[PDB]
Amino acid sequence: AENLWVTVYYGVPVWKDAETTLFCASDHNVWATHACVPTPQEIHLENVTEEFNMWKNNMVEQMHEDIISLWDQSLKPCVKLTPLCVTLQCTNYAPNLLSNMRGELKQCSFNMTTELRDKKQKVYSLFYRLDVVQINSNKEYRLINCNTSAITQACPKVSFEPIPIHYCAPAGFAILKCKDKKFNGTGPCPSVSTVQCTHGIKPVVSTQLLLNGSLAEEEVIIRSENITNNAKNILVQLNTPVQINCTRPNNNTVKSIRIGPGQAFYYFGDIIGDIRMAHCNVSKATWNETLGKVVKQLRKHFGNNTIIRFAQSSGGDLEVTTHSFNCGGEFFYCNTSGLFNSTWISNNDSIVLPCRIKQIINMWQRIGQAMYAPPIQGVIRCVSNITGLILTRDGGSTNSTTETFRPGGGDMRDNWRSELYKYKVVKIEPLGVAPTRCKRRV
Amino acid sequence: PQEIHLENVTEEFNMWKNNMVEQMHEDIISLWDQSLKPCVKLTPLCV
Amino acid sequence: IRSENITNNAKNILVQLNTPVQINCTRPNNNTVKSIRIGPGQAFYYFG
Amino acid sequence: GRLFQSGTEVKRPGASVKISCRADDDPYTDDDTFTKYYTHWIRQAPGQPPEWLGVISPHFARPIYSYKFRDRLTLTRDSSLTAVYFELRGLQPDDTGIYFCARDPFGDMYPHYNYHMDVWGGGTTVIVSS
Amino acid sequence: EIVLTQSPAILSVSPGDRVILSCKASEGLSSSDLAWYRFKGGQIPTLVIFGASNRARGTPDRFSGSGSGTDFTLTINRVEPEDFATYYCQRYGGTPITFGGGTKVDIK
Amino acid sequence: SLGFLGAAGSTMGAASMTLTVQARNLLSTHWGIKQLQARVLAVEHYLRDQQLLGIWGCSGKLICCTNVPWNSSWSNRNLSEIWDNMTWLQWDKEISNYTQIIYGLLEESQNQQEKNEQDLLAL
Amino acid sequence: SLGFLGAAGSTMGAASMTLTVQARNLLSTHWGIKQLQARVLAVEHYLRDQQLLGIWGCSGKLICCTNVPWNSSWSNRNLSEIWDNMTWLQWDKEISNYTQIIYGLLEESQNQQEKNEQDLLAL
Amino acid sequence: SLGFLGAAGSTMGAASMTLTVQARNLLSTHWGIKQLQARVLAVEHYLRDQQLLGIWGCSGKLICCTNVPWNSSWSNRNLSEIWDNMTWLQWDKEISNYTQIIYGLLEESQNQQEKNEQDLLAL
Ligand SMILES: *[C@@H]1O[C@H](CO)[C@@H](O[C@@H]2O[C@H](CO)[C@@H](O[C@@H]3O[C@H](CO[C@H]4O[C@H](CO)[C@@H](O)[C@H](O[C@H]5O[C@H](CO)[C@@H](O)[C@H](O)[C@@H]5O)[C@@H]4O)[C@@H](O)[C@H](O[C@H]4O[C@H](CO)[C@@H](O)[C@H](O)[C@@H]4O[C@H]4O[C@H](CO)[C@@H](O)[C@H](O)[C@@H]4O)[C@@H]3O)[C@H](O)[C@H]2NC(C)=O)[C@H](O)[C@H]1NC(C)=O
Ligand SMILES: *[C@@H]1O[C@H](CO)[C@@H](O[C@@H]2O[C@H](CO)[C@@H](O[C@@H]3O[C@H](CO)[C@@H](O)[C@H](O)[C@@H]3O)[C@H](O)[C@H]2NC(C)=O)[C@H](O)[C@H]1NC(C)=O
Ligand SMILES: *[C@@H]1O[C@H](CO)[C@@H](O[C@@H]2O[C@H](CO)[C@@H](O)[C@H](O)[C@H]2NC(C)=O)[C@H](O)[C@H]1NC(C)=O
Ligand SMILES: *[C@@H]1O[C@H](CO)[C@@H](O[C@@H]2O[C@H](CO)[C@@H](O)[C@H](O)[C@H]2NC(C)=O)[C@H](O)[C@H]1NC(C)=O
Ligand SMILES: *[C@@H]1O[C@H](CO)[C@@H](O)[C@H](O)[C@H]1NC(C)=O
Ligand SMILES: *[C@@H]1O[C@H](CO)[C@@H](O)[C@H](O)[C@H]1NC(C)=O
Ligand SMILES: *[C@@H]1O[C@H](CO)[C@@H](O)[C@H](O)[C@H]1NC(C)=O
Ligand SMILES: *[C@@H]1O[C@H](CO)[C@@H](O)[C@H](O)[C@H]1NC(C)=O
Ligand SMILES: *[C@@H]1O[C@H](CO)[C@@H](O)[C@H](O)[C@H]1NC(C)=O
Ligand SMILES: *[C@@H]1O[C@H](CO)[C@@H](O)[C@H](O)[C@H]1NC(C)=O
Ligand SMILES: *[C@@H]1O[C@H](CO)[C@@H](O)[C@H](O)[C@H]1NC(C)=O
Ligand SMILES: *[C@@H]1O[C@H](CO)[C@@H](O)[C@H](O)[C@H]1NC(C)=O
Ligand SMILES: *[C@@H]1O[C@H](CO)[C@@H](O)[C@H](O)[C@H]1NC(C)=O
Ligand SMILES: *[C@@H]1O[C@H](CO)[C@@H](O)[C@H](O)[C@H]1NC(C)=O
Ligand SMILES: *[C@@H]1O[C@H](CO)[C@@H](O)[C@H](O)[C@H]1NC(C)=O
């Protein structure tokens, strides 16, 4: 009985780190829910440790491709907007207006082909300031993204609201889920669970903020890789949601035209009402309390007497120096610089943010391809939660007491790293090896 | 060919509910446009 | 040498040499290349 | 393969310089190089060690400056996804030297999350006198 | 701020031996964020090594080097006439990054 | 009665009776080829483990016995410290670099068993 | 000598000698993805039934025996009225709602036959 | 210690000990559908041979014994000339036309053993 022999065991709870292919499960149309597996049933584990680590996972980098391929699939069979690149005779609509909106809302006229190729059609439309570029009385403007890209009109039948989907694993793989109250990026998890697939993950597109995301526990927690390093973004997560309200009070008109045989084009009509500017309202008291709470949370890493100073953005393109999101089918760009005022020392109104509208957008830097945004008829409103901010800090010398913090980011994976941080794909192996006193017969 | 006859067995046969007459209707319309993809698009005829 | 049939003059005769012999050729013109934009998003590189 | 920057411009004290560092020279090209790769700009004075000047991210051209050259350095790219620029206002007779632009993944790629400047491009010279 | 210094500033060697390019760090480098560059006067400064010890694409078998903590060494196997040029080491981490001063090899 | 992967943090002496909850779940447009790639990989990963257990004389069993002696160079641990304290995850990390020889050593115990029985059956 | 699915209407006592023709036929552009799904689905449907028979001690057999007793609450019929008058189609409809409780009960008889045989072989 | 397909020209009496190296290597964009068909074809070709060996009472074994006698009409060679002189490639060409009758005669020996064992175990 002393001479031990080796035995193999089938169906043994042991796993390894591996990457695999996740599929969709979610239960007119949207970009995602067209062909997915119809869907809880969790299993809790006890006193087993696991080294959870984000920013090196294989789930936030597969989703970054599974979102852009799904976006290209919803943009391929639509109408290709080739003949729009003509000379646009374009002047200022609503002249001598003493309001703020002066440079935008330009009226341009151009020729467009119809179903009969020998005949043309003169059409009138309104385009924003970020949609027309002058080229060398009325001036002759052209499109913004024509000389380096080919714009395609998006399909008006599909919608752009984020339907919550689930990334689900096949047989042989599992998803470890950390169920800790406080949990930073890299480290052990005291209580894990084995899940097939997760809760509602909203694939919302947003920069400089985290709209309609998952909530947190009773305390605000910050997350970074090596936060003394000022190169990685700081993914904070608020404990209570703060609401932002913005509408578009100009009454819209959407007019239809036929550019060719079988195709269609929905363009901007007139404005029947008042020429106003869209603006997002936030409550000042709870936002100031949230800023004080996240400053008190961030003060646990840099001592007591260090002056934390919130500042505005650095610059670059429009998707970092402003905040961009998607409301109902329209893409907004608001400056949000009224939320990062003067600094913080230890010893009933509403804040408005001016927000503009750009039709031609270019998401995920697809060179050679661009999408057109059709207008939405009527007044459209959007109320949104804010669960999480995107902050980064700068460097400095040794004698520096004013630690600055600017809202940057811009990475689309950071919006999916605040909702897939507590999940980890894992591959189980059913072959176990153990010695015992057993011996087979002859 | 190669049929197999059966005895002493009854089966509840029912048309207008089969999944074969609704799969063929999709397989025909999915094969109709496949023979029109490499052909010429008749775009500039509408004069 | 290799063929399907030696007495059949319809099939090709593939020979294989024992030593590699070199062959050199250049294009001695400078052949500058110019570009033009043929439409939205495309490109056209023509002869200079 | 290699990056391309041009310019042998002389300058006067009180002006601004513009250095463009492009990848694949033909202008109508879609390299996609300025798309998933960070880009470092590095100055070097003759007889002096090279110092860091500024990195630009490939996500939406969000720049990260240093504290020495903060208030007088703007850099971004145009509407096309090539040809990042370098505008250094508030000149001085101290920064006379060569300039370099290098491609760097900066730990954002899929294999191994490395930290290396795999290719440097050209190297222009900026002098200033009166 | 971590200052990066190099004590062998002037070096001279014959073609066909091993040379040691040492570098001292200030306070506790992370042993995975360091790079070496081969500079020259009016040429293209290329990279020779990744991190601690990992070769690049255009790097032969004769280039290597290791080190951890605050000391980092570059160990060239053999000396070629196409390698007599100055070398510059750099680190990563918090902005701004700082180079390692400067060293130079020579023929004698 | 623990569930799928329920005894992963338990003792190896207590996890040897719940081997069926992990052995029965190994088999159970853009997404047209995404869902098809997993149904081949899972079947291949199940069939590889079924082929590895078929050439050891353990095809159809969960806890089988072999004639290969356990060497002391792989692990110097006794019986009272493995099946009473260690879990199945801590034991796999100790013999992780010895899997490629034992899987060879389990092969020669098969061909030396089927041959020496074969001439026993020809008499 | 009946053929594939030839004894589907015969007696269960006479259809137990022709189980081989139903167990050997389980494995034997627009149409590029249509034909590929069937070769995955048939392999998966065969491997599911092969996995369900491998964890019951019946891997490699057709008519095996178990230790689970037959409860009288499922059916009150005797041996003389099942294997002499009823076919398999009339028998499958009578215990169609008791399949999920037998398939678990056949599982716990495996480890109970595997654990008690383990320590008997360790002596 | 020969390798994969190393004993292909060797003696059948000497190649019967190296049956492990051939039984373990059966499992291990334009090219997106080209690589997907090959794994499905390999899985089907492995599962067909695993199904043919599972209905003969030889599941999990490499060298098994059957009850079907060897007819003299298939080959008139003795034992001293098959396992000493001939290889497997020269032996497969001699019974290349008598495969489907041996494959049919091997199927009834499973049922004629299983029914008798079921009648013996019912007492
Ligand atoms: C973060 O999350 C929050 C969630 O809290 C998001 O906020 C919501 O965002 C959605 C975006 O889709 C908003 O939905 C839109 O609401 C529009 C306003 O309609 C409301 O007012 C009318 C007034 O009569 C009510 O009737 C509506 O009630 C409807 O819903 C209830 C639900 O029970 C039904 O019972 C009713 O019968 C109504 O059906 C709303 O309260 C609304 O117009 C809009 O609907 C258009 O689009 C859909 C989808 O395409 C069409 O099916 C529909 O017919 C509408 O179509 C328009 O365009 C076509 C173009 O041809 C025209 O022909 C039509 O006439 C019409 O003009 C849509 O449903 C929602 O209001 C909003 N708030 C709340 C509290 O839910 C944030 O957006 C999100 N932030 C992000 C993602 O950044
Ligand atoms: C994140 O970045 C920080 C800052 O670079 C890293 O901390 C550094 O860690 C090293 C050890 O790997 C420390 O070096 C040690 O220094 C002491 C003397 O101070 C010496 O006695 C030791 O033998 C060792 O060399 C270094 O001091 C430390 N730097 C700071 C500022 O604390 C850290 O490793 C990085 N990674 C993480 C947190 O995962
Ligand atoms: C967002 O708001 C800020 C603050 O109002 C704007 O910053 C102004 O920028 C101009 C440009 O030179 C300065 O002359 C002003 O002094 C700045 N304002 C203040 C109060 O300092 C900024 O332009 C706005 N827009 C964007 C896109 O950031
Ligand atoms: C494509 O068109 C855009 C829009 O005009 C060009 O962007 C402008 O380029 C000029 C070059 O003299 C700059 O002065 C402007 O500041 C640019 N406008 C911006 C950045 O909004 C772009 O250069 C064109 N691309 C070409 C010709 O390749
Ligand atoms: C974990 O919990 C189980 C019961 O829940 C217990 O038997 C076991 O000893 C525990 N392990 C440790 C290391 O405490
Ligand atoms: C449309 O074409 C006619 C043809 O001559 C031209 O006169 C007119 O100016 C064009 N329209 C615009 C807006 O340029
Ligand atoms: C995460 O939190 C734990 C708990 O205090 C701590 O030990 C660990 O160092 C933290 N890791 C990081 C990267 O902040
Ligand atoms: C925003 O909209 C919500 C919707 O109910 C409303 O309760 C709230 O008063 C509005 N204003 C602010 C400042 O939150
Ligand atoms: C924000 O909250 C703090 C609470 O510490 C309070 O002192 C301060 O007056 C509030 N308002 C502003 C504008 O900071
Ligand atoms: C900063 O102040 C808080 C007050 O609660 C204290 O707990 C903490 O220890 C202080 N930080 C340092 C580094 O002393
Ligand atoms: C923030 O508010 C203060 C209050 O007076 C104001 O002075 C400052 O200009 C504001 N910040 C911005 C960016 O407008
Ligand atoms: C906008 O214009 C339409 C056009 O008929 C009108 O019916 C509607 O009342 C107007 N106002 C709003 C708020 O939609
Ligand atoms: C914001 O969060 C609260 C928290 O429960 C939720 O009730 C509300 O619906 C959220 N608002 C949204 C999703 O617009
Ligand atoms: C060609 O021939 C030379 C010398 O005959 C040889 O060195 C070389 O490897 C050959 N192949 C190629 C591709 O140059
Ligand atoms: C079918 O039923 C008849 C009488 O009902 C019986 O004689 C016969 O054996 C049964 N089976 C077949 C295969 O005909």
Numbering used by the authors:
A (entry chain K): 31 to 57, 66 to 77, 81 to 140, 149 to 185, 187 to 309, 312 to 321, 321A, 322 to 398, ...
B (entry chain R): 81 to 127
C (entry chain G): 272 to 309, 312 to 321
D (entry chain H): 2 to 35, 35A, 35B, 35C, 35D, 35E, 35F, 36 to 52, ...
E (entry chain L): 1 to 27, 27A, 28 to 107
F (entry chain J), G (entry chain Q), H (entry chain C): 519 to 546, 569 to 663
Quoted passage from the original study:
Here we describe bNAb 1-18, a VH1-46-derived CD4bs antibody that exceeds the potency and breadth of most classical VH1-46- and VH1-2-derived bNAbs. To characterize Env recognition by the 1-18 family of bNAbs, we solved cryo-EM structures of 1-18 and 1-55 Fabs in complex with soluble native-like Env trimers and the V3-targeting bNAb 10-1074 at resolutions of 2.5 Å (1-18 complexed with BG505SOSIP.664) and 3.9 Å (1-55 complexed with RC1, a designed immunogen that is a derivative of BG505SOSIP.664; Escolano et al., 2019). Both complexes contained three 1-18 family Fabs and three 10-1074 Fabs interacting with three-fold symmetry with a SOSIP-Env trimer. 1-18 and 1-55 recognized the CD4bs similarly to other VH1-46-derived bNAbs, including 8ANC131 and CH235.12 (Bonsignori et al., 2016, Zhou et al., 2015), with interactions encompassing contacts with the N276gp120 and N197gp120 glycans, the CD4bs loop via the CDRH2, the V5 loop via the CDRH2, and loop D via the CDRL3.
We selected antibodies 561_01_18 and 561_01_55 (hereafter referred to as 1-18 and 1-55), two representative members of clone 4.1, for further analyses. To determine binding of 1-18 and 1-55 to the BG505SOSIP.664 trimer in the presence of other HIV-1 bNAbs, we performed competition ELISAs and detected interference with 3BNC117, N6, and VRC01. For example, whereas 3BNC117, N6, and VRC01 bound similarly to YU2gp120, YU2gp140, and BALgp140 and were reactive to the V1-V3 loop-deficient gp120 variant RSC3 (Wu et al., 2010), bNAbs 1-18 and 1-55 showed lower (YU2gp120, YU2gp140, and BALgp140) or no (RSC3) binding to these proteins. Compared with the epitopes of the CD4bs bNAbs 3BNC117 and VRC01 (Lee et al., 2017, Stewart-Jones et al., 2016), 1-18 and 1-55 bury more surface area on both the primary gp120 epitope and the adjacent protomer, another potential mechanism for their increased breadth and potency (Chuang et al., 2019). Finally, the slightly higher neutralizing activity of 1-18 compared with 1-55 might be explained by variations in glycan accommodation. We detected no recurrent mutations at contact residues of 1-18 or typical CD4bs bNAbs, and pseudoviruses derived from these sequences remained sensitive to 1-18. In addition, whereas some bNAbs demonstrate binding to self-antigens (Haynes et al., 2005), we found no indication for autoreactivity of 1-18 or 1-55 when tested against HEp-2 cells.
